[PDB]
Design a protein around this ligand. Structure first.
Ligand SMILES: CCCCCCCCCCCCCCCCCC(=O)OC[C@H](COP(=O)([O-])OCC(O)COP(=O)([O-])OC[C@@H](COC(=O)CCCCCCCCCCCCCCCCC)OC(=O)CCCCCCCCCCCCCCCCC)OC(=O)CCCCCCCCCCCCCCCCC
Ligand SMILES: CCCCCCCCCCCCCCCCCC(=O)OC[C@H](COP(=O)([O-])OCC(O)COP(=O)([O-])OC[C@@H](COC(=O)CCCCCCCCCCCCCCCCC)OC(=O)CCCCCCCCCCCCCCCCC)OC(=O)CCCCCCCCCCCCCCCCC
Ligand SMILES: CCCCCCCCCCCCCCCCCC(=O)OC[C@H](COP(=O)([O-])OCC(O)COP(=O)([O-])OC[C@@H](COC(=O)CCCCCCCCCCCCCCCCC)OC(=O)CCCCCCCCCCCCCCCCC)OC(=O)CCCCCCCCCCCCCCCCC
Ligand SMILES: CCCCCCCC/C=C/CCCCCCCC(=O)OC[C@H](COP(=O)(O)OCCN)OC(=O)CCCCCCC/C=C/CCCCCCCC
Ligand SMILES: CCCCCCCC/C=C/CCCCCCCC(=O)OC[C@H](COP(=O)(O)OCCN)OC(=O)CCCCCCC/C=C/CCCCCCCC
Ligand SMILES: CCCCCCCC/C=C/CCCCCCCC(=O)OC[C@H](COP(=O)(O)OCCN)OC(=O)CCCCCCC/C=C/CCCCCCCC
Ligand SMILES: CCCCCCCCCCCCCCCC(=O)OC[C@H](COP(=O)(O)O)OC(=O)CCCCCCCCCCCCCCC
Ligand SMILES: [Zn+2]
Lengths: 141, 141, 75, 147, 62, 107, 230, 73, 226
């Protein structure tokens, strides 16, 4: 049985509605921007258009497309180094999805997978990526 | 558009009378209960019956109009909208071009002709002995 | 997957409700042929008045192949 | 469809942790969007790219439980588990399960009226109808007389 | 809006009543004089009191 | 044009043969200038004035319902004399229509 | 809950401003008038401060109320010019055959039209940036340069004109119509000197007001140019 | 307002600028730009000056040349 | 509602600088004793502590889950009060149109005070008459003298207070088991390690529990120039 809950929005001017408690839990979970992360999936046509604005991203985006990776943009800037982990991450996520989906109803046991390669997770919280927004070339050449 | 209108060009609050067409009717629909079938006599009025947030569609309209104000990315309009937004700006710019490249040349030509022939090239020459340039806009004579 | 560039998408339609906005039958969206005919007439009158100054003072001698009550005479 | 497509509020991210858009007057940093798209990728291109929410796999058992307890919610939870839920899919889920508040007339205290008075309701309605009947007829009578 | 000007507030109780030393209640200025003269007529007029009611308004000579 | 409410014949049939139109007096009473007490100070005279408002009066019918003081315009709805702040709560103009929605009912 | 409107109970600028107006009548020296005008400018600024502080009420109708007020003001400005055009054209039958030199139709009209068109383009770019939540520093200084040239040209024209206000009703109407336009150009300087970027953006009545007002001044000059120069 | 599609039918992207290589002729580029930003602004902006210029300069023939050759006295 | 202005930044979330510095007492304060800012952070700290512990969510009941996030379970009493609040708020800047009022179903006129001005416009079509204004006072079943429409005043009153969202929560929500600071620490170490802080509210909250400026980088975080 799922009880109904009051959901309120706004700080000084507050609007209240009835909502699903599970939906609200998902809503607040997706607000944890550091934990739940949006990831980008490319297609060949879009990758080509990227080159019109950033040649380096086009090459890195092509690598992600060729491996069918859903990748965060910040990670994409380091896809040259992160590729072996990203491929391992892709397999582990797929394994977890298969196990949970295939489990019988009422079976809420955690999936068995290698969390050390999945980011962000408690086992691996990610790397401190340095900013790449610095120039390397000499204007007079 | 420049001018603010509560009904259509309401950029101060962003209120919209109807939800986006993207949502399925099941998720959200315009607030229209004009077609409601007759109420059975054995049904009893529990709520006020007053038009307001007790109706599901109006509640969802109010909720969406507040929660739409934060979005991850821009909702890109089509080029027709973008043209209309700066219609006056673009047209004034072309008017400036017309003044420089159309009006200027023939106005300069008329003054040079006037120097030699005492009257603009688009005017009948006088025989009455009066001196001076005379009229400029011939069709208003 | 396949996508459409938002810049070249079509305008969204007005919602169909009890209160539906409809400009389709108004004929106010753009200037029509009648407007451009008025412009053509204005150019013609402007040119004509300058070219033929005596048009406003026409001749009074009347000569009709089939008399004055024949249609071609009237025009 | 409001404010020309510009949201009133949106998230901006910076690569340098110590960056301040108000203190610094440098010209190399490029701000990112909520999904992480760098600013020099125009929205008409980035909006076409499909972004999906990825939750840590430890949340899958919980998302499964939500779907089973509420079957109407299952298709949205499945999309989230499979990494196929975009922002639009989340919005559809959010507004689909929003319900309006209920007012119960049975809980309203009533103005005090004695039992004897409550039995005279039909009589008072009867008097009101006769007043209207008399009113409407008199209008015709007076209109004829004075005009 | 939380913290905004309330749409309704109850009146605070009136200040304490004042009595003279002997106990007589203190009176305050009142511009409703009792004119002195021998006339005692009382005129009454049926007055509109809305759309469905009237009031019998009386004017007293005093 | 307005010509009163429409009436059906069945609505005029009485439930008793002795029914006649109720003779309730709609004259609110005898009034004059509001007469204050010399003992009342400024605050208590204000209370006195607030208790003499004709627009707060009504006539109770035989079924317990009351027909209040009514006016064509809202100028007669504020306290007399007009207070500094009149319509703290927005007056409601009640419109009627035949539209209804299912959420309001329960089976 | 809260009241729909946060009432304003007391105000004292009205007395000060009204007294400042009276000082103009009761002056015994034109120097007092100059300093009195500064007081009027100061107190009007305070009134504008109150309007900005009213934003704290978060009232949706405040923007609409001020916008429609400006529309009414714009109409009054148009009708004021209409009266001058009315005055000019009433004596039309007495023009063009009196021994006075009317203005040339080649030099003044063209450069002024070009100059004022640039002013419109600058303001249009300001509006576009305001739409895009963006700013360009140089734009304001282009307006000042534009206004500097306009002042320099008009000053020379009046000084070098060989006919005077008392020569004919034609000359009076020419000078007066041109001055009335200048005063409205100067009023634009008064407004534009404070242009800045405010982070509450499209709920700021100043931006829409400036765009409307600058457009009005420029269109009025087109009517003036057709009436007098062409 | 009548909803209607975007009439622009020219190329949507020329590709990344690489020292101005593999780009259309200049005149074609000007035509594409006006198509992209709308011909309605061009016609509206130029309409007033074209009308005034034609009327004034037409007098060279209508008012000056014709009058000299057409004066019955 | 249409008469509200744009959402503020605070309408979405509050800045961490508004977090009470005495977190230990904040998590022990009863709900009736928590202010708006204190209540906001109590729910966010406790709500995010449960949501950021995936392994425990599936075994947690909806009642417990709703309590942790600070969401109120709906019941007929609370639903009734909230519904009338929203109706009152909506009518502040919206028209008042509904079914014709009768003795069985009087027109409901919400009010905070004992009185509210109302107008009767009769029925639909020909039955509509000119506006008849009257003062709707509590405790009387009002009957329009022209159309015989029945009106009644509904007061949003409760125990010397008028109905508000916070009042409804305090009256009906019941505080559960006292929040355990061990859960805060346990979740803190889960998502915050070796200079990576993916659970920042807990990082600040844990720092306040340990005093202030104990965890790495928090002294630099709390030092301000103006
Ligand atoms: C021959 C060559 C030479 C030619 C020279 C020409 C000289 C012209 C001089 C003009 C001077 C400048 C004036 C305008 C300055 C601002 C320009 C500007 O910003 O334009 C772009 C901009 C475009 O707006 P947008 O929203 O981006 O539109 C996008 C699209 O265009 C699409 O927009 P949309 O169609 O979707 O609609 C949205 C927009 C559309 O509106 C506009 O865009 C307006 C554009 C107007 C441009 C000017 C054209 C000329 C107008 C002539 C009007 C004549 C009136 C009748 C006179 C009768 C005389 C006997 O609506 C608004 O903005 C609403 C504005 C408020 C209107 C208030 C009107 C009040 C008066 C009503 C009539 C009163 C009389 C009633 C009589 C009957 C009684 C029973 O315009 C505005 O936003 C301006 C609005 C604010 C200023 C309004 C001023 C109103 C003055 C009323 C005077 C009433 C006097 C009545 C008594 C008179 C007799 C005694
Ligand atoms: C065998 C013998 C053979 C003989 C052969 C002879 C051959 C003869 C050939 C004759 C040819 C005649 C052709 C006639 C047919 C014409 C068909 C046609 O196309 O008509 C339509 C055509 C264009 O109309 P349309 O189709 O509606 O326009 C389309 C638009 O795109 C509509 O789109 P939209 O509405 O979106 O347009 C943009 C609109 C969008 O609107 C908005 O964005 C919304 C806001 C609008 C309201 C704006 C409020 C104010 C704005 C403030 C900003 C101002 C900035 C400037 C400030 C200046 C400061 C100084 O915004 C604007 O347009 C306005 C803003 C732009 C700047 C405005 C500048 C000021 C304008 C007012 C003053 C004008 C006078 C200036 C005078 C000079 C300076 C003093 O009309 C004309 O061109 C007029 C007809 C002219 C006929 C002249 C006839 C006489 C001359 C004959 C010459 C040849 C004779 C030679 C001798 C021959 C002897 C034999
Ligand atoms: C080998 C060198 C050859 C040089 C050839 C000459 C080139 C001179 C170009 C001058 C263009 C001035 C345009 C003024 C309008 C406002 C421009 C603007 O928006 O600036 C924004 C710009 C940055 O604004 P922002 O807000 O930071 O950024 C806004 C945007 O986001 C970002 O803005 P943005 O970056 O997109 O800005 C684009 C552009 C937008 O404007 C344009 O692109 C317009 C271009 C128009 C070309 C005009 C050429 C005039 C030449 C006439 C010569 C006639 C000779 C006659 C001989 C007669 C013989 C008998 O603005 C500029 O680039 C403005 C000029 C920047 C220079 C600032 C440093 C001081 C002046 C240095 C002058 C050096 C001259 C060297 C000459 C050497 C010759 C061998 O503003 C400034 O830099 C600050 C104010 C200063 C700018 C104006 C400086 C005027 C200098 C005039 C020099 C020519 C004098 C000729 C006298 C002839 C007497 C007979
Ligand atoms: C194989 C076929 C090739 C055909 C090539 C055809 C080439 C035709 C070139 C025509 C050039 C005409 C130039 C006219 C410039 C006049 C400039 C002028 O008068 O400047 C002065 C004036 C300001 O002077 P004031 O003293 O202030 O007086 C007026 C206000 N009081 O300034 C202006 O007019 C500025 C505007 C400049 C206009 C420039 C026009 C250029 C036209 C080029 C046309 C090219 C056509 C090419 C066709 C190619 C076909 C294959
Ligand atoms: C003699 C002819 C006339 C000249 C003499 C002086 C006349 C003075 C009359 C001035 C009338 C002013 C009416 C203003 C109405 C519109 C107000 C308005 O919208 O202001 C707000 C608007 C936007 O504010 P927000 O906070 O974003 O939003 C507001 C709330 N939503 O702000 C502004 O308009 C900013 C204005 C800044 C410039 C102020 C300059 C004041 C100039 C006064 C001139 C006095 C000169 C006196 C000379 C006397 C001797 C000749
Ligand atoms: C196509 C674009 C242009 C459209 C122009 C529209 C013009 C509209 C005019 C409206 C007012 C009409 C008034 C009736 C016409 C009277 C004309 C007339 O008699 O003129 C002479 C007469 C003087 O003669 P007497 O007094 O007998 O002796 C004088 C001896 N010194 O003059 C007048 O009285 C006329 C003065 C009024 C006309 C000028 C001012 C009013 C017009 C303002 C126009 C404003 C801009 C356009 C607004 C409309 C825009 C859509
Ligand atoms: C207050 C003062 C205002 C200023 C003064 C205005 C006065 C005039 C105002 C008129 C209305 C202006 C707007 C018109 C809009 C328009 O064009 O409107 C265009 C409409 C057609 O509409 P659509 O094409 O949009 O459907 O045209 C018409 O309805 C009439 C004009 C068409 C041509 C008429 C032909 C006339 C014939 C005359 C005889 C010629 C003889 C030739 C012999 C060889
Ligand atoms: Zn009634």
């Amino acid at each position: 049985q799922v009880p109904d809950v009051f959901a309120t929005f706004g700080w000084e001017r507050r609007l209240t509605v009835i909502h699903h408690p599970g939906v609200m839990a998902i809503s607040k979970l997706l607000d944890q921007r550091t934990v739940v992360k949006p990831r980008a999936t490319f297609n060949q046509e879009l990758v080509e258009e990227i080159g019109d604005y950033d040649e380096d991203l086009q090459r890195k985006a092509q690598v992600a497309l060729d491996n069918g990776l859903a990748i965060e943009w910040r990670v994409l800037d380091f896809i040259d180094d992160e590729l072996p982990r990203l491929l391992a991450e892709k397999r582990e996520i797929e394994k977890a999805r298969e196990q949970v989906m295939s489990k019988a109803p009422g079976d809420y046991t955690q999936p068995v997978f290698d969390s050390s390669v999945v980011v962000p997770t408690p086992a691996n919280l990610g790397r401190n990526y340095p900013t790449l927004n610095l120039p390397s070339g000499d204007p007079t050449e | 558009k420049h001018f603010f209108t509560d009904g259509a060009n309401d950029y101060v609050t962003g209120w919209e009378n109807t939800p986006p067409l993207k949502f399925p009717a099941s998720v959200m629909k315009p607030c229209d209960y004009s077609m409601t079938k007759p109420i059975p006599k054995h049904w009893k009025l529990r709520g006020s019956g007053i038009h307001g947030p007790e109706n599901t569609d109006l509640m969802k309209l109010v909720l969406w109009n507040r929660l739409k104000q934060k979005r991850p990315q821009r909702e890109v309009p089509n080029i027709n909208y973008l043209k209309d937004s700066i219609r006056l700006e673009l047209s004034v710019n072309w008017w400036l071009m017309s003044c420089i490249f159309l009006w200027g040349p023939w106005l300069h030509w008329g003054q040079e002709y006037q120097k030699v022939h005492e009257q603009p090239p688009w005017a009948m020459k006088r025989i009455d002995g009066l001196r001076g340039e005379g009229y400029f806009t011939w069709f208003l004579e | 997957y396949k996508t459409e560039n938002p810049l070249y998408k079509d305008d969204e339609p007005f919602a169909k409700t009890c209160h539906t906005f409809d400009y389709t039958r108004e004929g106010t969206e753009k200037n029509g042929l009648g407007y451009y005919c008025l412009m053509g007439l204005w150019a013609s009158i402007f040119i004509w008045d300058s070219l033929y100054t005596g048009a406003t003072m026409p001749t009074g001698v009347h000569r009709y192949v089939w008399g004055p009550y024949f249609p071609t005479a009237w025009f | 469809a409001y404010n020309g497509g510009y949201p009133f509020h949106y998230v901006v991210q910076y690569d340098d942790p110590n960056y301040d858009c108000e203190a610094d007057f440098e010209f190399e940093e490029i701000p990112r969007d909520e999904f992480g798209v760098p600013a020099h990728i125009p929205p008409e291109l980035s909006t076409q790219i499909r972004h999906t929410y990825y939750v840590p796999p430890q949340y899958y058992p919980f998302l499964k439980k939500l779907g089973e307890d509420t079957p109407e919610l299952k298709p949205y939870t499945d999309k989230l588990i499979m990494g196929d839920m975009t922002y639009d899919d989340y919005e559809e889920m959010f507004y689909k399960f929003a319900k309006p508040l209920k007012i119960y007339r049975s809980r309203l205290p009533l103005p005090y009226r004695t039992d004897e008075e409550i039995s005279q309701e039909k009589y008072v309605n009867w008097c009101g109808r006769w007043y209207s009947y008399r009113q409407r007829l008199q209008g015709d009578y007076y209109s004829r007389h004075y005009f | 809006r939380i913290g905004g000007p309330p749409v309704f507030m109850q009146f605070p109780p009136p200040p304490p009543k004042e009595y003279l030393a002997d106990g007589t209640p203190k009176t305050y200025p009142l511009h409703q004089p009792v004119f002195d003269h021998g006339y005692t007529w009382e005129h009454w007029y049926m007055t509109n009191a809305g759309v469905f009611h009237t009031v019998y308004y009386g004017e007293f000579a005093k | 044009i307005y010509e009163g409410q429409t009436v059906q014949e069945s609505e005029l049939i009485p439930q008793e043969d002795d029914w006649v139109i109720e003779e309730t007096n709609f004259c609110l009473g005898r009034n004059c200038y509001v007469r204050f007490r010399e003992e009342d100070d400024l605050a208590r005279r204000a209370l006195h004035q607030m208790d003499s408002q004709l627009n707060k009066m009504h006539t109770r019918l035989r079924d317990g319902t009351v027909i209040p003081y009514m006016s064509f315009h809202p100028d007669e709805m504020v306290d007399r004399p007009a207070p500094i702040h009149t319509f703290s709560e927005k007056p409601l103009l009640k419109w009627t229509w035949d539209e209804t929605y299912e959420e309001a009912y329960d089976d | 809950f809260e009241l729909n409107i946060n009432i304003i109970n007391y105000n004292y600028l009205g007395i000060i401003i009204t007294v400042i107006i009276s000082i103009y009548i009761y002056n015994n020296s034109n120097i007092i008038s100059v300093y009195n005008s500064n007081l009027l400018l100061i107190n009007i600024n305070i009134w504008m401060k109150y309007n900005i502080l009213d934003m704290l009420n978060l009232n949706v109708l405040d923007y609409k109320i001020l916008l429609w007020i400006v529309v009414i003001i714009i109409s009054n400005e148009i009708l004021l010019f209409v009266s001058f055009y009315w005055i000019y054209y009433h004596n039309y039958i007495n023009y063009y055959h009196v021994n006075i030199l009317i203005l040339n139709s080649y030099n003044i009209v063209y450069n002024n039209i070009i100059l004022l068109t640039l002013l419109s383009t600058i303001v249009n770019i300001k509006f576009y940036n305001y739409i895009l939540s963006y700013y360009k520093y140089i734009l304001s200084y282009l307006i000042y340069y534009n206004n500097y040239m306009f002042n320099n040209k008009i000053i020379l024209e009046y000084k070098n004109n060989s006919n005077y206000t008392n020569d004919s009703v034609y000359m009076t109407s020419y000078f007066y119509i041109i001055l009335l336009h200048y005063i409205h150009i100067y009023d634009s300087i008064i407004l534009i000197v404070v242009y800045n970027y405010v982070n509450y953006k499209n709920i700021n009545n100043y931006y829409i007001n400036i765009n409307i007002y600058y457009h009005l001044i420029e269109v009025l000059y087109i009517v003036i140019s057709i009436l007098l120069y062409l | 307002h009548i909803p209607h599609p975007v009439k622009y039918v020219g190329p949507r992207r020329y590709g990344r600028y690489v020292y101005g290589m593999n780009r259309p002729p200049v005149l074609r580029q000007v035509k594409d730009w006006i198509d992209w930003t709308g011909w309605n602004s061009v016609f509206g902006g130029f309409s007033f000056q074209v009308a005034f210029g034609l009327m004034i300069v037409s007098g060279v023939y209508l008012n000056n040349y014709r009058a000299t050759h057409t004066l019955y006295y | 509602y249409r008469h509200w202005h744009r959402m503020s930044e605070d309408d979405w979330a509050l800045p961490l600088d508004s977090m009470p510095e005495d977190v230990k007492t904040l998590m022990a304060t009863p709900q009736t004793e928590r202010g708006f800012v204190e209540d906001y952070w109590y729910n966010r700290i406790r709500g995010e502590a449960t949501l950021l512990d995936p392994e425990a969510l599936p075994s947690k009941s909806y009642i417990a889950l709703a309590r942790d996030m600070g969401l109120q379970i709906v019941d007929e009493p609370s639903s009734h009060m909230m519904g009338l609040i929203e109706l009152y708020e909506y009518l502040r800047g919206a028209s008042f149109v509904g079914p014709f009022g009768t003795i069985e179903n009087p027109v409901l006129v919400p009010a905070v005070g004992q009185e509210r001005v109302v107008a009767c416009t009769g029925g639909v079509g020909d039955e509509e008459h000119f506006t008849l204004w009257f003062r709707c006072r509590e405790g009387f079943m009002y009957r329009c003298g022209e159309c015989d429409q029945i009106f009644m005043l509904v007061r949003l009153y409760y125990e010397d207070r008028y109905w508000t969202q916070t009042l409804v929560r305090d009256t009906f929500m019941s505080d559960g088991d006292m929040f355990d600071l061990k859960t805060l620490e346990r979740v803190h170490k889960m998502w915050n390690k070796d200079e990576m802080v993916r659970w920042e509210v807990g990082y600040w909250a844990q720092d306040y529990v340990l005093g202030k400026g104990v965890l790495p980088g928090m002294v630099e975080e709390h030092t301000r120039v103006n």
